[PDB]
Structure 1
Amino acid sequence: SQKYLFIDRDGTLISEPDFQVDRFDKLAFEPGVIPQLLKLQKAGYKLVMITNQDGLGTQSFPQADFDGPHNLMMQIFTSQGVQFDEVLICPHLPADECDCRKPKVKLVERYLMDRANSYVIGDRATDIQLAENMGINGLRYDRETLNWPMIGEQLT
């Protein structure tokens, strides 16, 4: 029974801008995310990224626009020793009414792990609802009030 952290991307690992990181100059890391995720890995947590990317692939959010910043974000995490077991993406618009948009559990169905010691960490109510739907704990990330240093201390 592995301990997992299911971590939101936009607004949680990196800053959330039109709400899409579609340019290199819109990429910024959240404070302390690297050293704290390293700390959490050391304590035995495995990391899984799970993200809604509204309209990824469309005129308003071309795949290539997402790829640049995302791949770089991944370069930085990986070179610093932070590893994500999977990066799980829902590219759909809300109007699409798809199977995979958080807080639906589709993307994570295979994990449904040590439930008592697993968490979804994200900055929206839907991340917390995903945790409920998965039967695990939820941590509502907030840069000011419940941030990476706080989570790193709490969970270790």
Structure 2
Amino acid sequence: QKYLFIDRDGTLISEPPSDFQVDRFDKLAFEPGVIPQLLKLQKAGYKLVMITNQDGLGTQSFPQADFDGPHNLMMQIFTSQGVQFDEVLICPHLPADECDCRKPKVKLVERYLAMDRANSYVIGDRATDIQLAENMGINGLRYDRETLNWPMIGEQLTRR
């Protein structure tokens, strides 16, 4: 089974530069082409897993209720349009917590470590996403809106 492990903020949707928290609906914005391109990847046989660090989620620094609105709407868009994430894996911890689950640590994905390592990828916009790939023994794709965007990824990962 080929899997794509996909970061959320800065990858599926834009990342707010002030506080890195999508905690209001007016901060939710989809990255270009993510929907048709994930549908294309699924049609080529990829299954999808979301993985994300949501620093302080569920505490007063990032209330669960504030995260839920935009996140649940985002998920409603994906599901209604046919994009199905097998799991949504969330680390809610602060860096200072020194938790076992914060990417690029692999605790959240340990069950996958099971999959076709040659043809599975992490897709994310940060060096930590690329390090997650290395830690999982799979390939990493560094999402960039201009130079490695959703249409390019859709093409690259279906090349034969």
- TM above 0.5, one fold? yes
Within 1, Cα distance between the matches of 2:155 and 2:22? Answer: 29
**By how many angstroms is 1:71 displaced?**
0.2
Q: TM-score, normalised by structure 2?
A: 0.96
In 2, Cα distance between equivalents of 1:28 and 1:110: 31
Moved over 2 A (4+): none
Identify the residue that residue 105 of structure 1 maps to in structure 2.
Answer: 106
The Cα offsets for residues 33-72 of structure 1, whole Å up to 9 and x where unpaired, read as 0000000000000000000000001111000000000000
Task: Note the C-alpha offset of 1:133.
Answer: 0.3
Once the 2 structures are TM-superposed, how far is the Cα of residue 31 of structure 1 from its aligned partner? 0.1
CA distance in 1, matches of 2:154, 2:123: 12
In 1, distance between residues paired with 2:28 and 2:61? 18
Counterpart of 2:86 in 1: which secondary structure?
strand
Unaligned runs of 5+ in 2: none
Partner of 1:146: 148
Name the CA distance, whole Å, in 2 between partners of 1:55 and 1:63: 9
Distance 2:30 2:80 in 1: 14
Supply the distance in 2 between the matched residues of 1:25 and 1:78 (Cα, whole angstroms).
21
Q: CA deviation at 1:75?
A: 0.2
Q: Secondary structure at the match of 2:49?
A: strand
Task: Give the RMSD, CA atoms, in angstroms.
Answer: 0.4
- The C-alpha deviation readout for 1:81-110, integer Å capped at 9, x for no partner, is 000000000000001010000000000000
Cα separation, 2, equivalents of 1:51 and 1:75: 18
TM-score by length of 1: 0.98
**Does 2:14 match 1:15?**
yes
Q: CA deviation at 1:144?
A: 1.0
Instruction: State the identity %.
Output: 100
